[PDB]
Structure formats: C-alpha cells, structure tokens
Amino acid sequence: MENFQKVEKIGEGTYGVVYKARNKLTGEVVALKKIVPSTAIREISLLKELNHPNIVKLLDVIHTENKLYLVFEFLHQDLKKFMDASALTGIPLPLIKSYLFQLLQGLAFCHSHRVLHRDLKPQNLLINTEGAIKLADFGLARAFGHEVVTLWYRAPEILLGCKYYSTAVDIWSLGCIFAEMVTRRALFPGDSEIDQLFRIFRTLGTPDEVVWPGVTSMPDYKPSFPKWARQDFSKVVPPLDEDGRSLLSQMLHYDPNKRISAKAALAHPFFQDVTKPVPHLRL
Ligand SMILES: CN(C)C[C@@H](O)COc1ccc(Nc2ncc(Br)c(Nc3ccccc3)n2)cc1
Numbered sequence: 599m600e601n602f603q604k605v606e607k608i609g610e611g612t613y614g615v616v617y618k619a620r621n622k623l624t625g626e627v628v629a630l631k632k633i634v635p636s637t638a639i640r641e642i643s644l645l646k647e648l649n650h651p652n653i654v655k656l657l658d659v660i661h662t663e664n665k666l667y668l669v670f671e672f673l674h675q676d677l678k679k680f681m682d683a684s685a686l687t688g689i690p691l692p693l694i695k696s697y698l699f700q701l702l703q704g705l706a707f708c709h710s711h712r713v714l715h716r717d718l719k720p721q722n723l724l725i726n727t728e729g730a731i732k733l734a735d736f737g738l739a740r741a742f743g744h745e746v747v748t749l750w751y752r753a754p755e756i757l758l759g760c761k762y763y764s765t766a767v768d769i770w771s772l773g774c775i776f777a778e779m780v781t782r783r784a785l786f787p788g789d790s791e792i793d794q795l796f797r798i799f800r801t802l803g804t805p806d807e808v809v810w811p812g813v814t815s816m817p818d819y820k821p822s823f824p825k826w827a828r829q830d831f832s833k834v835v836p837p838l839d840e841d842g843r844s845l846l847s848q849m850l851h852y853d854p855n856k857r858i859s860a861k862a863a864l865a866h867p868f869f870q871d872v873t874k875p876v877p878h879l880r881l
Contacts, residue, residue: 599660599667602630609676611735612717613742618672628657629673633666633742641741642668648713652704654724654734673724673732674881677775680725683880685782688837693875694779695842695868697723697731701772704733706860709765713737716763718771719751720778729876749794750784751775754805755854757795759817766854769863773849780838796824802850803828810852841868 605618605627614633621628639661646656660667677697681689689697701723708714716739725731753770755763777785786801788794799805804825805813813819831843838846845868848858858866 599662602628604630609721610745611722612747613738614666614668627672629654629670631668631670633668634661634664638666638741641737642666645713645737645741648708648711648737650704650707651730652700652732653708653736654732670734673734674726675724675879676721677723677725677731678720680877680879681720681779681782688782689779689877690875691780691837692873693729693877694776695872696729696874697725697779698772698776699864699869699872700731701733701775702860702863705765705768705772706864708733708736709768709860714740714765715768715771716740717751718768718775719748720775721748723775725877725879727876727879727881729874749788749791750786752794753854754795754798754852755816757791757798758813758819760854761817764854765859766857769849769857769860773846776842776846776849777835777838780835780842785834796826799823800826801829801834802852805852813852841866841870844868 601622602619603622605620607615608618608629609616611631614631616629616631619628619630620626639659642659646659649655654673655671656668657671658669660669705715713736715733715736717735718733722734723731724734751771751774753763753767756767774785786794786797788797804823807814814821831847835843835846845858845863845866849863851857
C-alpha cells in the first residue's frame with residue numbers, strides 16, 4: 599500500500615471499501631478495493647485472467663498482513679449516479695440499448711467461462727466518456743461471500759432458497775436494471791426478502807408449477823404465499839417498445855432454465871439497430 603495515495607472514498611462495496619487512488623511510482627490512477635482463506639486468493643487469481651472490454655480490468659491483487667487489496671482500472675462514473683443525473687429527462691433509448699448490449703456481451707464472456715456475478719446493480723456498473731459500460735466486482739461473491747445490501751436485483755430462485763443458482767441470476771438482475779433505466783424507477787424495490795419476493799409476485803404473478811416446474815418444492819416456497827395475477831408488460835415498462843418488452847420478458851422468466859441466456863439475448867431483434875452513442879457526463 600505504500601505505493602498508493604488515497605484520493606477519495608468512492609463507495610462502500612458489500613465486502614470492503616473502494617477508493618480512488620494514485621500509484622506513487624507510476625502516477626497511474628486506479629480504484630483500490632480493501633477487502634484470508636487460501637481458496638479466496640486462488641479464486642481471485644483466476645479473475646485476473648478474465649479479461650474483456652466490458653469487465654473492469656483487475657490490475658493486481660495485493661495480499662499483505664493478512665489483508666487483501668484489489669487494484670482495478672479506474673472508470674469515470676457509476677451507472678447509479680448517471681441514472682440519478684438523467685432522472686429529469688431519462689437516458690436516451692439508443693444509449694440504454696447500447697449499455698444493455700455491452701453488458702450482455704460482458705455477461706456472455708463471463709458465463710462462457712462458468713463465472714457469474716451474483717450481485718449486479720447500478721452501483722457496480724461503470725461507465726466512461728467513450729460510451730462504454732463495464733461490469734465490476736465480477737466473481738467476487740464466489741470468492742468471499744453497516745449499509746444495507748440491496749435486494750432489488752435478486753433473482754427469485756435465490757430468494758426462494760436455491761443453493762446452486764446459475765448464470766440465469768445475472769440475466770434477471772440485468773433485466774431489472776434495464777427496466778429501471780427505461781422507466782426511471784426501480785422495478786422491484788423490496789426492503790426485506792419477503793417484500794422483495796412479494797413485489798416480484800405482484801408484478802409477474804405468483805409462480806406455480808405451470809410456469810415454473812419444481813417451484814413449489816423450493817426450500818423457502820410456502821403454499822401459503824398469496825396468489826397474485828400477472829400484469830401486462832405494457833403496464834410495467836410503458837416507454838419500452840414491443841421488441842424491448844419481448845426481450846425484457848425473456849430476461850425475467852421465473853424458471854431459470856427458460857430465462858434467456860446472454861448469448862441468445864445478443865441475437866434478439868431489439869439489437870438489430872444498436873449503436874454506440876456517447877453519454878453526456880458531468881465529471
Ligand atoms: C453520487 N456520488 C456521491 C458518487 C457515487 O455514486 C460514487 O461515484 C463513483 C465514481 C467513480 C467510480 N469508479 C470506479 N472505478 C473502478 C471500480 Br473497480 C469502481 N468500483 C466500485 C464498486 C462498488 C462501489 C463503488 C465503487 N469504481 C465509482 C463510483
């Protein structure tokens with residue numbers, strides 16, 4: 599750490615704090631995350647070879663004094679701040695589509711390598727002046743495990759107690775983020791696990807064996823769950839055109855096995871006219 603000078607605290611990640619910092623030697627500006635099981639070290643090390651233009655580059659891992667520091671490339675701003683800054687007018691559809699397309703590319707890459715994120719949210723989606731958006735904190739959840747942790751983007755199978763979830767959990771989270779960018783309001787803003795689950799049920803309808811075979815046998819499934827009817831997507835995300843709504847619905851399928859994959863999503867008609875606009879960023 600003697601090689602880094604902290605510039606500012608840019609966030610309180612789930613496991614550890616994140617700082618903007620400068621390399622005292624190279625002068626390089628980076629994002630420094632201060633998080634130790636040997637398994638953790640090895641898992642983190644694999645993440646170092648997981649390089650892709652839509653994944654925040656992990657530059658180095660520093661393990662000193664039973665302490666763990668992760669050095670990442672520094673991005674200009676996070677998606678949450680950009681969304682808040684665009685709340686009055688909303689992010690232009692072309693930019694929303696570009697961002698969704700790039701994130702699906704990033705997920706396709708990670709998923710092809712059997713690595714999933716597990717905790718996607720606006721706060722860990724980072725953007726730059728060039729129009730790129732990248733996934734951060736990727737694979738860390740599987741490595742490690744007083745601000746409240748947001749449940750807004752958690753897939754239903756996780757909420758229902760599935761112990762071995764799949765890459766589908768990331769698609770669900772990205773779908774929730776996609777909706778939020780479009781409507782400028784969180785899709786499922788639950789403040790507890792049951793409230794998160796019921797908010798999902800109230801919108802997509804309480805799941806049953808018809809739409810999700812095996813759901814009634816899930817660890818936390820209760821026959822006593824209220825039975826809400828499903829709502830039309832035209833009501834859930836009005837601004838989104840039919841192509842977008844079709845894609846969103848496949849990203850929010852209850853059954854993880856029926857949920858669209860990142861690779862298949864990339865071939866969806868919605869992206870026929872995708873472009874790469876540049877955002878208006880106030881740094
Ligand atoms: C609204 N105000 C207070 C700003 C806040 O949203 C915060 O603004 C920023 C400004 C710049 C960055 N860059 C950044 N670059 C690389 C990484 Br790896 C990273 N990881 C990170 C992961 C989780 C939480 C916080 C950070 N962040 C991130 C957030």
